[PDB]
Design brief:
Four copies of one chain form a homotetramer. The first copy, chain A, has 351 residues and is an alpha/beta fold. The first copy, chain A, has helices at 7-15, 18-25, 32-39, 88-97, 112-116, 133-145, 164-169, 191-198, 205-214, 227-235, 257-268, 283-291, 301-310, 312-333; strands at 44-46, 61-63, 66-68, 72-74, 102-105, 123-127, 150-154, 219-222, 240-243, 274-276, 297-299, 346-348. Chain A has a six-stranded parallel beta sheet. Bound molecules: flavin mononucleotide (4 copies). Chains A, B, C, D: It is found in: Peroxisome.
Chain lengths: 351, 351, 351, 351
């Protein structure tokens, strides 16, 4: 009997082949930030208010115009068909059924349209401004046609972080899986090898402004841990900021997103929504993020680990667990809406 | 040979069935606060005064008018007949013999009158303002008739905390045990299932004020970790405040009651007594609580664990150990009365 | 090959019977302060000065008028003949040979005169102001006749701390050992049982002043962790203060003597010398104590553990190791005398 | 597959004889500072700037006039032929090929000229001002003739630190190895025993000034952890300061060089370059050192451990790994030159 979200990592570690579990579970180098992404939540306590009528909890929120059932969303991860045959189809169905947003990786094993064919649902598309700006365009288009509503642009990955497990595992994408967003596209004449060499080391904020010249979809600038870049993201025309450290997969010894969050929220000055991912496993984590000023969180690994465990039902139970846990956190904190989740409902180390 | 209170948990873990030990030992979720309830005592040091005549130690105190032999009382816990055949009878006899107060859970396996039939003793009755306000009335009445002197109203449990062991253990109350306070009552036509669905998610402070319209017994508002609600408890007409985090069984990542205590004591402004429970195992813990300004502490789990171990004699030895340990702490601190236990006799992390 | 002092504890644990090792090694309750006595040294760093001629290191000091070869002395411990047949004879010979002071416990297995018969040496006598003030007198006399030069009066032990190992081990003094300072004395008509019941719970500072009416020997008030009592010790007529926590054997959760030291040194205002014991195993510990303002340290357990290990040679090597280690600490810190050991040569957590 | 620098320690521990691994791996006493040299890097986080064109990273720097490919250099270590037959030859070839500086120990198993015969390369010579000032002269000369460009004078070793493993291992230099810098020199009529007795306990800053009377080569004063001595090093005529704690091999409980670094950099006031060694294993460590104001770092043990592992190729891969890791740290921090590595790119505990 699985009772918390973290237990799916343990199950996925048993069930998956080492190189796949590692590929997902990996953080950069000595995985300090990966641990810190979890540990830092445990250095924030609650300051609950009691004896408040919490019989009607509303955790529903609006994200870039779209109403969703909870401030708990799915972050993009690569190649989900290594975890489970359905892969991103199951994620889409689960995310649609949960009434929340799913971000799809450009490195997904299922295309935007494949995911869209599972049924209606609000979905964002994770991108890099790759070197081949025509390929970036095609992807964007492909996403717009598939009914995707925003672009989570990765901005902390001019180069890939050193996840040493992969080198030690000789990590190769399995035989019958492809990066389906790049299939059928004009690449200018191995696809994983292609996209890896396509990650652009030269990106500036002008390239974020450029991304806005090829799509009218709101741009979530994804991977901002500093108030300095939080400011620049607003000025660059970002629809929102995801305080992400790429699941601690890029630069290690970068702060946890929870430490980083409040600096970014304040720097954004309410001009745009500030989301978080990295180390959210508990409903208490969701709350803490929101009390620090986040507009909602994404989960990455729990989706792939639970997908690996129980398929769609695994992702269903992760969203449901986080939901129930978060509703209970709200109840036991005295919060009947997300607006009622205030800074005074928590205390951090760094107060 | 058992020499400290904590050793009864180890013995109870060996002796009990997993689901019963867990049921009692459980904290909410990743049991962070459960650990913190103990660990936080170890981040408070003593500042003992020496060469004071400590041959006559008086630890006797008065709690809501009633003289007791020590500021160490028994907190309410559910269904003690899972731990040991005698259950709450043994707790009552032990608490009477120790000359201290016992709080009985509404979820006890023995009724208020059953407990009262063991002999004379000062006893409080733990309650929820359940949805069926008529049932709450009957319980209150039943307690008053049984010679119970106060109501510890639980106020941090509009919904039950997620103690995952129970879900993983498929926790069912054993065959011949019942919640005896609810037996013989008009329930308006499984009792554990009933009372679980009776925990009221809608309670406000008006319902605390309502509890005072059906009993003249002093109301200990139980589960206040904030100065904000400490203030509201005074204004609501509480006879006292128990700084409790429900043995870390409700919201996890709530502060330890020892961190929380001093904020609550100060907020109460001496208008009412402020008690503590959660993580008291040592006489040094009792002292530390008292030096932070508590009027006395309750112990929960040590009672059920020692009951599980050695029956009544186990609870006898827990009270006696805590007593002797606390008398010695007082001696070695230079404190010959509870009034002589001052803030300057300790130092915390947070000074 | 034994290379540090701590290694003698490991050897003594192997070699001794459990109840004897425990008796010595025991701290009070959950042995928090016992650990802290060591750990706290590791939260003080050095601020060494380099390129200073350290070819001539003088660690010689004067303690209550007596010149000694180093600020590293032997603290009193009970019944050393449980550790090794020679017991306190070996300690005396070792302490004489090292040119340092040895404090003898009133609970020693060898009398003051027995110890004195090993040869010349500077020695202090540890006392309690026991209930039978005539017995205290006789002991004092006995010490003066044996050529003992000061009284280390224990002042943190109105009652014995709860060292649980002893209760769990059913700790009895071996058959042919006695408390030899009490042998041949008028006890007013088991000796361990006697002296245990003689520890006086009523002592005030007036009884310290009383001790000064029966001896002209300087009184080291032993067991002061507070500036408040450091002040009172000066006013009471103490020749010095030993910042001791009874090897963490009395009140647990009392601060380490190293945290406590600087508060006591400052409170004493240079009027009297302030010594330390508790958790000194390294020459770096000796330095740190001295830089915090101590006039010298005592070691307790290392003496009995090394005695248990290698007899007199064990205590010889402990003193020699601490010495060499301390000379090297002095060299590598830039300190050629104890006067040159300054506060700026260290940094603590609490600066 | 080796993926980080630390993994070479594990391999060297397997491969080497205990006394050799220990000899190298040893820190002083309880190896607190040795751990701290690593651990302290993990208490400094990054504050990366994103979306900066990092396609052209320049980590090239100038050290005492000499252009080198990176701010990552080789610290001197003794007797490298115990690790691997080639020993310091392999280090020289690797350091030449990496386009960085190698410091050679006076206690090397290969002479300055032997090392110089591997091919061209920028190299410093580590010295003690030994008691026999004529021997120091000869060494200096020997280094100048071998094309060595600076003297790293050790200044934290008036006496050797107590590395207990060596005493426990009965550490002897193997049969056919010698301290080749002392071979062929006029010693005034065992060489390891000789040089050990030659370490001068009397050195002052006047002896640093004296070293400058026998060579015009720039003097790196090596082993300064204090602003006080950082100041004195400038005044003494040092070409630079290496904030080193002798790989935590001298005084234990000395601060990590990373804690110490910023105090020394500020005290030097930009008058001379301030380098660091001790606990650099990651490119992130290199960055952190540089952001604290270091002009470049040296690595000691990784060279001998990787030499022990894979010979020259091992040292090649350590330099290459640190390089690649450091280039990536620079990329992911937004730093395209070492000048662009600023204090604001990190945050420590002690800010
Ligand atoms: C296998 C894998 C691949 C990922 N790929 C990307 C990526 O290409 N771009 C990106 O911005 N983030 C990427 N992420 C980061 C996630 O989008 C998300 O920030 C992270 O998983 C959240 O942390 P969590 O795993 O603790 O929930 C990836 C994460 C994983 C586990
Ligand atoms: C099995 C069990 C059931 C409990 N049930 C309740 C309850 O219904 N209401 C309540 O306010 N507290 C409840 N508590 C909390 C205790 O009253 C008390 O606050 C706690 O046990 C004190 O912490 P300790 O166990 O560390 O002594 C329960 C505790 C246990 C162990
Ligand atoms: C077996 C034993 C008995 C002791 N008895 C006494 C005592 O009767 N009075 C006293 O003041 N201190 C007593 N002490 C404390 C020591 O004098 C000394 O303060 C302590 O051993 C120093 O700490 P260390 O063991 O870490 O060196 C005793 C210590 C031990 C280990
Ligand atoms: C075996 C060995 C011998 C060393 N000998 C010396 C020495 O004679 N003089 C000196 O200044 N530093 C000496 N060091 C310190 C190194 O030069 C350097 O400061 C240290 O290795 C850097 O730390 P790291 O090992 O973590 O890289 C020695 C280090 C080792 C491992």
């Amino acid at each position: 009997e699985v009772t918390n979200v973290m237990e799916y990592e343990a199950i996925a570690k048993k069930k998956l082949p080492k190189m796949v579990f590692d590929y997902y579970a990996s953080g950069a180098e000595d995985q300090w930030t990966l641990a810190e992404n979890r540990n830092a939540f445990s250095r924030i306590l609650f300051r609950p208010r009691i004896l408040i009528d919490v019989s009607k909890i509303d955790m529903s929120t609006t994200v870039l115009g779209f109403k969703i059932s909870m401030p708990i969303m799915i972050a993009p991860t690569a190649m989900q068909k290594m975890a489970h045959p359905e892969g991103e189809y199951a994620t889409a169905r689960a995310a649609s059924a949960a009434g929340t947003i799913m971000t799809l990786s450009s490195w997904a094993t299922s295309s935007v349209e494949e995911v869209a064919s599972t049924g209606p649902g609000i979905r964002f598309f994770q991108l890099y401004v790759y070197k081949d700006r025509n390929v970036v365009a095609q992807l964007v288009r492909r996403a717009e046609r598939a009914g995707f509503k925003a672009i989570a642009l990765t901005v902390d990955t001019p180069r890939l972080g050193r996840r040493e497990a992969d080198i030690k595992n000789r990590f190769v994408l399995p035989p019958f899986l492809t990066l389906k967003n790049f299939e059928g596209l004009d690449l200018g004449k191995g696809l994983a090898s292609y996209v890896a060499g396509q990650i652009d080391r030269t990106l500036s904020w002008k390239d974020v402004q450029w991304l806005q010249t090829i799509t009218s979809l709101p741009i979530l600038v994804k991977g901002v841990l500093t108030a300095e870049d939080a400011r620049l993201a607003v000025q660059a025309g970002a629809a929102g900021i995801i305080v992400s450290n790429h699941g601690a997969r890029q630069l290690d010894y970068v702060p946890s997103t929870i430490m980083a969050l409040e600096e970014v929220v304040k720097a954004a000055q309410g001009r745009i929504p500030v989301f978080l991912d990295g180390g959210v496993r508990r409903g208490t984590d969701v709350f803490k993020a929101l009390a620090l000023g986040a507009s909602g969180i994404f989960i990455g690994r729990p989706v792939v680990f639970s997908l690996a465990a129980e398929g769609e039902a695994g992702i269903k139970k992760v969203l449901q667990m986080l939901r129930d846990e978060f509703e209970l956190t709200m109840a036991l904190s005295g919060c009947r809406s997300l607006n009622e989740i205030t800074r005074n409902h928590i205390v951090t180390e760094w107060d």
